[PDB]
């Protein structure tokens, strides 16, 4: 276990932070920990990114910024406006992927219709 500060530093100063973390995970690296887990009932809408925790029975809810590689690395978000989709919100992670919330949000996309994670919650 290399520690959160060692992993985040390695990714933060890489020319491509996302690729650095994905290559680290693929190599067998232990996921980033100390994401902020929310107390919830697991009776929510199950939507991906919400104003309040919305985990269903198949999900865990976390503080959004704690699960964002760019927020955790203190670097710019890689879009024109440098906007973060997660900061100030709550993110629902499938239980099967909740050992690595940072890797999950990095690798996945929210369906613009149902507002659930494409390939997991989404039933479109
Ligand atoms: C129903 N309960 C207690 C659940 C459901 C999903 N995930 C966790 N961690 C707990
Ligand atoms: Cl460390
Ligand atoms: Cl590099
Ligand atoms: Cl989902
Ligand atoms: Zn962020
Ligand atoms: Zn959908």
UniProtKB/Swiss-Prot annotation:
Zn(2+) 8 binds at residues 111, 114, 122, 124. Zn(2+) 7 binds at residues 68, 71, 77, 84. It comes from the Viruses. Residues 4-124 form the ExoN/MTase coactivator domain. It is found in: Host cytoplasm, Host perinuclear region; Host cytoplasm; Host endoplasmic reticulum. Forms a dodecamer and interacts with nsp14 and nsp16; these interactions enhance nsp14 and nsp16 enzymatic activities. Plays a pivotal role in viral transcription by stimulating both nsp14 3'-5' exoribonuclease and nsp16 2'-O-methyltransferase activities. Therefore plays an essential role in viral mRNAs cap methylation. This is Non-structural protein 10. The gene is rep. The chain holds residues 4263 to 4383 of 7096 of the full protein.
């Amino acid at each position: 276990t290399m520690g959160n500060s060692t992993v985040l530093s390695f990714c933060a100063f890489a020319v491509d932070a996302a690729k650095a973390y994905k290559d680290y995970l693929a190599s067998g690296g232990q996921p980033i920990t100390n994401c902020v887990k929310m107390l919830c009932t697991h009776t929510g809408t199950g939507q991906a990114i919400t104003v309040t925790p919305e985990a269903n029975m198949d999900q865990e809810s976390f503080g959004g910024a704690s699960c964002c590689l760019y927020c955790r690395c203190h670097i710019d978000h890689p879009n024109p406006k440098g906007f973060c989709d997660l900061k100030g919100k709550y993110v629902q992670i499938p239980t099967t992927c909740a050992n690595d919330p940072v890797g999950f949000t990095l690798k996945n996309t929210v369906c613009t219709v149902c507002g659930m994670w494409k390939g997991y919650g989404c039933s479109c």
